[PDB]
Curated annotation (Swiss-Prot):
Positions contributing to Mg(2+) 2 binding: D80, D83, D196
Cofactors that this protein relies on: Mg(2+)
CDD domains found in the cross-reference section: CysQ
Protein EC: 3.1.3.7, 3.1.3.11, 3.1.3.25
Catalyzed reactions: adenosine 3',5'-bisphosphate + H2O = AMP + phosphate; beta-D-fructose 1,6-bisphosphate + H2O = beta-D-fructose 6-phosphate + phosphate; a myo-inositol phosphate + H2O = myo-inositol + phosphate
Gene Ontology terms: biological process: 3'-phosphoadenosine 5'-phosphosulfate metabolic process; sulfate assimilation
Quaternary structure and partners: Homodimer.
Keyword hit for Hydrolase: yes
Listed name of the protein: 3'-phosphoadenosine 5'-phosphate phosphatase
Keywords (A to Z) from UniProt: Hydrolase, Magnesium, Metal-binding
């Protein structure tokens, strides 16, 4: 008998525990095998528990076929059973996450992000707080970006703004680094899926921070095509500066 937020948190933790077990059982000799097992077993747990505890809700999971029944539903769980599979599959890495979000017909109303290797901490929309003090040196930004080849937009905004990119695996880990104050912002372009941003966005917004498309428009979920090209998540104070610079870069 859990609230949707309590369930999101419990699902995230439980999947987190299972992933930690898989990591210990399978080990790191074959990264691909380890990653596949984590993806598959975390997915199986989450679908089993959502069917048992929310039999009426639709589920959109990275690791399951998408039958689009969710388009007619008022309640949809949007989940990534293991975000940062590569990182998970690498010895010593703690930048991987479980994403559990509930979409209600519309916004992400309840959500949780677990970082299992970080003491299985679970960030949740019903307990995350709005006390964020501006961290770091004035006039300079630390921005979390993925461990891939940088988009054209960040190159351009770095001409005008002092920025140190911080390489972090996993969308969830990057978003929670914003929450923690380890970085000022998390910026992504070039493509992503709804389950990558739904739970982090829910938590971000619940913390009183900013989550939008790069052009400032709201993140939209439970779309036919669950692909979201770009995003910006950041401290509230930082949003005008970055949205401004992004818009200025389109000149
Ligand atoms: Ca995944
Ligand atoms: Ca992912
Ligand atoms: Na199963």
């Amino acid at each position: 008998d859990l609230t949707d937020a309590e369930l999101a948190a419990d699902l995230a933790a439980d999947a987190g525990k299972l992933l930690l077990q898989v990591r210990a059982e399978i080990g790191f000799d074959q990264p691909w095998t380890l990653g596949e097992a984590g993806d598959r077993q975390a997915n199986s747990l989450l679908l089993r528990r959502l069917q048992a505890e929310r039999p009426g809700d639709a589920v959109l999971s990275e690791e399951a076929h998408d039958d689009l029944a969710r388009l007619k539903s008022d309640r949809v769980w949007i989940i990534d059973p293991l975000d940062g599979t590569r990182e998970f599959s690498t010895p010593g890495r703690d930048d991987w996450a479980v994403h559990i979000a509930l979409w209600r017909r519309p916004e992400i109303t309840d959500a949780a992000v677990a970082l299992p290797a970080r003491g299985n901490v679970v960030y949740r929309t019903d307990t995350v707080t709005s006390g964020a003090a501006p961290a770091g040196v004035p006039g300079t930004l630390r921005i979390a970006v993925s461990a891939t080849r940088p988009p054209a937009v960040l190159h351009r905004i770095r001409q005008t703004l002092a920025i140190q990119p911080v390489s972090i695996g996993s969308a969830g880990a990057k978003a929670m680094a914003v929450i923690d104050g380890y970085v000022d912002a998390y910026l992504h372009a070039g493509g992503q899926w709804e389950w990558d941003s739904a739970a982090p966005a829910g938590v971000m917004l619940a913390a009183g921070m900013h989550a939008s498309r790069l052009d400032g428009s709201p993140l939209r979920y439970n779309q036919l095509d669950p692909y979201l090209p770009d995003l910006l998540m950041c401290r509230a104070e930082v949003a005008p500066i970055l949205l401004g610079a992004i818009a200025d870069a389109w000149r």
